[PDB]
Amino acid sequence: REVKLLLLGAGESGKSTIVKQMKIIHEAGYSEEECKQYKAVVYSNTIQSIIAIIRAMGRLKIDFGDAARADDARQLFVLAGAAEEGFMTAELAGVIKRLWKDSGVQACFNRSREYQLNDSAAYYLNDLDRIAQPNYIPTQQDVLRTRVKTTGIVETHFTFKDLHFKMFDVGGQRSERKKWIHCFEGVTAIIFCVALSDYDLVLAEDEEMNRMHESMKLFDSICNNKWFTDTSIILFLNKKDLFEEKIKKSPLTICYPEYAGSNTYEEAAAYIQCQFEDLNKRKDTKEIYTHFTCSTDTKNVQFVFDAVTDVIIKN
Ligand SMILES: Nc1nc2c(ncn2[C@@H]2O[C@H](COP(=O)(O)OP(=O)(O)OP(O)(O)=S)[C@@H](O)[C@H]2O)c(=O)[nH]1
Ligand SMILES: [Mg+2]
């Protein structure tokens, strides 16, 4: 049969990454020609990230560790143009490498909640040696890690357990929220994504607004929307990996001042689950099927999607 899945959630919550996983898990994964297409995206994400860290150092008044980096930073901008076209010269690679290793660069990297930085920055920057290689071809994980804002409506098709899925993805930034209603017809289930690690961040499109509060407002409106009464609500509390590392050092009280639990994964995670599940105004009549995920982890997504499928089949 025909199963219509709609991916919803604020910006950078992991929706497009789940879409990519369906291809890796239910199809062949990305072909060589397809991976080479993402080469420019990986290079562009890497360059953007190091530049965002360097922009930040000036704004925050953080000095380089070794004075010599000033020359590397200057050379960065000179050579950056190539990376956008899909080229990574040894010279530019070396420049980014030394900058990334610098103590002040790292100090600023560790204050990223104070500015805007891609989640994949470290992933690409720590793997710079591999991605800068001659004839580099993006791996499945590199593809999964890429970031490109979704404007418009993306539709994907795949067969799974005898069902023909038609998955829809739309942009979550505020400018894109208006396009959501175009997707509202015949939805079998909604997979609402939430970036767990967004609790200490603020909106790219607004400094005054905490990203998790924004996500709760969206969920509240989607979960309780009459149009969606007979649609299954599946909640993916995503980026559980980043959340696991982040909860150790950044207080959850930044997001929920009344949080009284410890700075540990299990306690904090269940607290957030309840915060969202409690927005359901009809607990007795409507169920929310919550799952903790790491969208970039194929094994995790596979087992979770498999469980999600059976729930769609049964209920
Ligand atoms: N480490 C980590 N990063 C993740 C996870 N799921 C998604 N990402 C990353 O976060 C970035 C944003 O995810 P993406 O899938 O683009 O979000 P989106 O909801 O589609 O964002 P938009 O199109 O509305 S602006 C990407 O670099 C992607 O790799 C996860 O669980 N762990
Ligand atoms: Mg997207």
Ligand 1 midpoint to CA 83 (Å): 21
Q: Give the residue numbers spanning the domain of 280.
A: 1-30+150-315
Same domain for 311 and 267: yes
Which member of 102, 169, 198, 244 is catalytic? Answer: 169
Ligand 1 midpoint to CA 255 (Å): 20
Same domain for 131 and 6: no
258: domain CATH number is: 3.40.50.300
Rounded to the nearest angstrom, the gap between the alpha carbon of residue 96 and the centroid of all alpha carbons in its chain is 23
Structural biology method used? X-ray
Which member of 55, 98, 113, 147 is catalytic? Answer: 147
Nearest atom in ligand 1 to 45's CA: 27
Q: Cβ(294) to ligand 1 under 6 A? A: yes
155 labelled catalytic? no
Number of domains within the chain = 2
**Pairs from 154-161 (Cβ < 8 Å, separation ≥ 24):** 154/16, 154/19, 156/19, 156/22, 156/23, 158/22, 158/23, 158/26, 158/27, 159/26, 160/26, 160/305, 160/309, 161/309, 161/313
Beta bridge partners of 167: 5, 156
306 labelled catalytic? no
DSSP secondary structure letters along the chain: -EEEEEEE-STTSSHHHHHHHHHHHHS----HHHHHHHHHHHHHHHHHHHHHHHHHHHHHT---SSTTHHHHHHHHHHHHHHHHHT---HHHHHHHHHHHH-HHHHHHHTTGGGS---TTHHHHHHTHHHHTSTT----HHHHHH------SEEEEEEEETTEEEEEEEE--STTTGGGGGGG-TT-SEEEEEEEGGGGG-EETTEEEEEHHHHHHHHHHHHHT-GGGTTSEEEEEEE-HHHHHHHHHHS-GGGT-TT--S-SSHHHHHHHHHHHHHTT-TTTTT--EEEEE--TT-HHHHHHHHHHHHHHHHH-
Same domain for 171 and 292: yes
37 labelled catalytic? no
66: domain CATH number is: 1.10.400.10
Distance, first Cα to last Cα, the chain: 14
